[PDB]
């Protein structure tokens, strides 16, 4: 789809509409010292094999898009996470869908 | 082998058993009901002698939710004299001439328990135009009462 | 091994055997679901 790089939406700090900048959300590392992996290590350590399941049978071919907003106003610098329906193709700030013209 | 709609209408008329009988007054409300349970009954337009023979011989009262015989007028008056009815004849007047106080006189009476027809019936599964017993047999109901009683 | 798949045969007998009872109505019904802005004034009127 297409989305522009800016808009004006609600900042839950300033209590108003203010303009934002936009960028796509990615996912971070795992940090290796969370209580989840610490357990999974103390358990997977030794003899016995594999202890917790594994996932193999997939169906989906898409992902729900997630955006990341940032108030341009300095001394606010608040951020949010916003969501969209699913799509196979995505794009930030492309063309403008010209009407009336010829296609070559 | 009877239907729910029909099982209802009979037990309003207090006919919960074979060869029982009750009087009833006539209007648009009642007559349509009788068309609904037509094949299971047999009704008619009676005279005075039949009212006598029913009430004296086979005619009992409902008292304290019990069934008690009409042997004396104390019973009638004590339960029913606030309407100006103190004896047998006052009923019969109230019944034969459908009066103002009909509902109470009839509901005082228990439904009559009769015996099977001496002589026989033609065919109970049909109407009284095709050689049967069902439906309306207007004046000939009295001929039958002579043989049930 | 095949079987039956749907039936509503006997059910009306089951339903009426205990009855079909309409709900029990009361006066002074409940004020659950009405407009907030109207409900509010009722309080203030009764508060004075």
């Amino acid at each position: 789809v297409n989305v522009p790089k800016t808009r004006r939406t609600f900042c839950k700090k300033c209590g108003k509409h203010q303009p934002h900048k936009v960028t796509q959300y990615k996912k971070g590392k795992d940090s290796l010292y969370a209580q989840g992996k610490r357990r999974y290590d103390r358990k997977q350590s030794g003899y016995g094999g594999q202890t917790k399941p594994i996932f193999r049978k997939k169906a989906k071919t898409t992902k729900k898009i997630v955006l990341r907003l940032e108030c341009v106003e300095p001394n606010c610098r608040s951020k949010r996470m916003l969501a969209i329906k699913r799509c196979k193709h995505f794009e930030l700030g492309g063309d403008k869908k010209r009407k009336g013209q010829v296609i070559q | 082998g009877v239907s729910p709609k029909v099982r209802k209408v009979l037990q309003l008329l207090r006919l919960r058993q074979i060869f029982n009988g009750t009087f009833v007054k006539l209007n648009k409300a009642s007559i349509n009901m009788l068309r609904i349970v037509e094949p299971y009954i047999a009704w008619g337009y009676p005279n005075l002698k039949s009212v006598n023979e029913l009430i004296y011989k086979r005619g009992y009262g409902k008292i304290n939710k019990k069934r008690i015989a009409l042997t004396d007028n104390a019973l009638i008056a004590r339960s029913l004299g606030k309407y100006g009815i103190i004896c047998m004849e006052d009923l019969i007047h109230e019944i034969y001439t459908v009066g103002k106080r009909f509902k109470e006189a009839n509901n005082f009476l228990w439904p009559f328990k009769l015996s099977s027809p001496r002589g026989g019936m033609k065919k109970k599964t049909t109407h009284f135009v095709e050689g049967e017993d069902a439906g309306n047999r207007e004046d000939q109901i009295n001929r039958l009462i002579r043989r049930m009683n | 091994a095949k079987s039956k798949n749907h039936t509503t045969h006997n059910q009306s007998r089951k339903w009426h055997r205990n009855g079909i009872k309409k709900p029990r109505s009361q006066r002074y019904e409940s004020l659950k679901g009405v407009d907030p802005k109207f409900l509010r004034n009722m309080r203030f009127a009764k508060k004075h």
């Binding site: - | 006539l26 209007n27 648009k28 409300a29 | 059910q11 089951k14 339903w15 009426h16 079909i20 009872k21 309409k22 709900p23 019904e29 679901g33 009405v34 407009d35």
Partner: protein, 159 residues
């Protein structure tokens, strides 16, 4: 096996009748719906917002709430023996007052009057409906003419 859509089996119900498509005649809107009123329901499919479910098309109910554009209604529903009461919010153009009580209202007012006036008289006159009774012994005239005489007709293989 059937599906579960919200408009399955409504080709004709949520369909406007013949030569009555178009804009809405707007005495529908200008009516007054106060609390306690008895109301019947009929889904107009010309406008899709706030319309009720199939199960309430043709049912009658009673008001409990009033909004800017809609009404709250209490409706009964028979579902597997037990009956339930239900509170559906519905917009105006799917409703209509019901004449199913105006007859009662004409009576009680006429009946209050007819009691109070003609009370000084002393008689307790009839006040309450009675069914259709039997039909009044009377005469019939043959103003001269003998009646007609009918009989059946022979069959014919007309077609």
């Amino acid at each position: 096996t059937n599906t579960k859509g919200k408009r399955r089996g409504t080709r004709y119900m949520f369909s406007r009748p013949f030569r009555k498509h178009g804009v809405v005649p707007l005495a529908t809107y200008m009516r007054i719906y106060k609390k306690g009123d008895i109301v019947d329901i009929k889904g107009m499919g010309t406008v899709q917002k706030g319309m009720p479910h199939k199960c309430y098309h043709g049912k009658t109910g009673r008001v409990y709430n009033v909004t800017q554009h809609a009404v709250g209604i209490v409706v009964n529903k028979q579902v597997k023996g037990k009956i339930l009461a239900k509170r559906i919010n519905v917009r105006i153009e799917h409703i209509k007052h019901s004449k199913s009580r105006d007859s009662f209202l004409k009576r009680v007012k006429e009946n209050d009057q007819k009691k109070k006036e003609a009370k000084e008289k002393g008689t307790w006159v009839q006040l309450k409906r009675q069914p259709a009774p039997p039909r009044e012994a009377h005469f019939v005239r043959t103003n001269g003419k003998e009646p007609e005489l009918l009989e059946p007709i022979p069959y014919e293989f007309m077609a």
